[PDB]
Design a binder for this molecule. Structure first.
Ligand SMILES: [Ca+2]
Ligand SMILES: [Ca+2]
Length: 68
């Protein structure tokens, strides 16, 4: 009876999992470690150019915005 999690349940899980600090937001450094798994460095320019708020970190929302 419990409503499952949006099809993006996987993305949300991984993101949160990478955030052992349970802050709900990943920092530039974190974004590099997560993407590092692919060996892609472009993630740095993408996360820096995607940060319109210059907060230096991305929350669940942002993480879901960077997937395509
Ligand atoms: Ca984090
Ligand atoms: Ca941001």
């Amino acid at each position: 009876g419990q409503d499952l999690s949006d099809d993006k349940i996987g993305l949300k899980v991984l993101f949160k999992l990478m955030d052992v600090d349970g802050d709900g937001k990943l920092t530039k450094e974190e974004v590099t470690s997560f993407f590092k798994k692919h060996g892609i460095e472009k993630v740095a320019e993408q996360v820096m150019k995607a940060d319109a708020n210059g907060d230096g970190y991305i929350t669940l929302e942002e993480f879901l915005e960077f997937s395509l």
